[PDB]
C-alpha cells in the first residue's frame, strides 16, 4: 500500500511539474 | 450545395460583387443570403473519433477480436467489458453490448 500510494503521488507530482515548468497556476529533483 | 432549380446542375459561386450570386450554365441565378457567404474553412482539431470510428465503436461489443477487461458495466452489470483504444491520443473507451459507452462517444 505504501509503495503504491508513493508511486501514484510521485507520478501526479511528476506530471504537475512537467506541465508547469514555466507556466503559472493562475523543480527537477523533488 | 447549390443546384440549379431548373436543370439540377452544379452552380458556381462567382464572388461578385458585394454579394454572392450562384450562376448556372443555363443562366439561372439564385442569389445568396447570409449563410451562403462562407468561402472556405479548415478547423484545427485532430479528432475524428466522433464520426470516423462511430460505426466501429458501435460494433465493438459484438466484435469477438476486441480486447476485454474485467470490469462491471454500470448499466447491465456484466462483469466483462470490451476496451477500445483510439487514435494518436490513445483514448481508451469502454463499451458494452447493452449500449453503455463510458462518457465517450
Amino acid at each position: 500500500k505504501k509503495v503504491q500510494t508513493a508511486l501514484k503521488a510521485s507520478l501526479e507530482f511528476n506530471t504537475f511539474y512537467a506541465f508547469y515548468e514555466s507556466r503559472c497556476p493562475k523543480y527537477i529533483i523533488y | 450545395m447549390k443546384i440549379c432549380k431548373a436543370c439540377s446542375s452544379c452552380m458556381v459561386r462567382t464572388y461578385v460583387d458585394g454579394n454572392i450570386i450562384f450562376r448556372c450554365s443555363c443562366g439561372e441565378s439564385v442569389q445568396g443570403d447570409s449563410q451562403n457567404l462562407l468561402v472556405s474553412s479548415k478547423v484545427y482539431h485532430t479528432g475524428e473519433m466522433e464520426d470516423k470510428y462511430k460505426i466501429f465503436i458501435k460494433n465493438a461489443p459484438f466484435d469477438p477480436t476486441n480486447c476485454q477487461i474485467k470490469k462491471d458495466c454500470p448499466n447491465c452489470h456484466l462483469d466483462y467489458l470490451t476496451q477500445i483504444c483510439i487514435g494518436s491520443q490513445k483514448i481508451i473507451i469502454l463499451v458494452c453490448r447493452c449500449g453503455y459507452m463510458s462518457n465517450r462517444g
Binding site: 514555466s22 507556466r23 | 464572388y15 460583387d17 458585394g18 447570409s34 449563410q35 457567404l37 462562407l38 484545427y44
Partner: protein, 76 residues
C-alpha cells in the same frame, strides 16, 4: 461599421468589434478594405503553453503584412 452582413455563425463578433474600435482608436478600417475576410480563433492552450503574447502576434502580423488590416480582441 455601418451594418454589413456577415456569416450568421460568426455574427456576434460586432459587440467585441466595437470594443476593439473604442479601445484601439489609433487604427481604423482603411478605405481600401476589400470584400474578403479571414476569421481566426486562437488556441489559448498553445499560446499559454509557449508563452506567446497576443500583442506579439498582432504586432508581428501587422509588421509582416501591412498590406492586410488586422483587428484583435481582448483575451486576458
Amino acid at each position: 461599421t455601418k451594418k454589413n452582413v456577415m456569416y450568421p455563425d460568426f455574427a456576434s463578433d460586432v459587440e467585441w468589434m466595437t470594443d476593439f474600435l473604442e479601445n484601439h482608436p489609433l487604427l481604423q478600417p482603411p478605405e481600401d478594405i476589400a470584400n474578403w475576410c479571414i476569421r481566426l480563433e486562437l488556441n489559448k492552450t498553445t499560446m499559454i503553453l509557449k508563452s506567446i503574447s497576443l500583442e506579439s502576434i498582432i504586432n508581428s502580423l501587422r509588421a509582416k503584412h501591412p498590406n492586410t488590416y488586422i483587428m484583435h480582441s481582448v483575451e486576458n
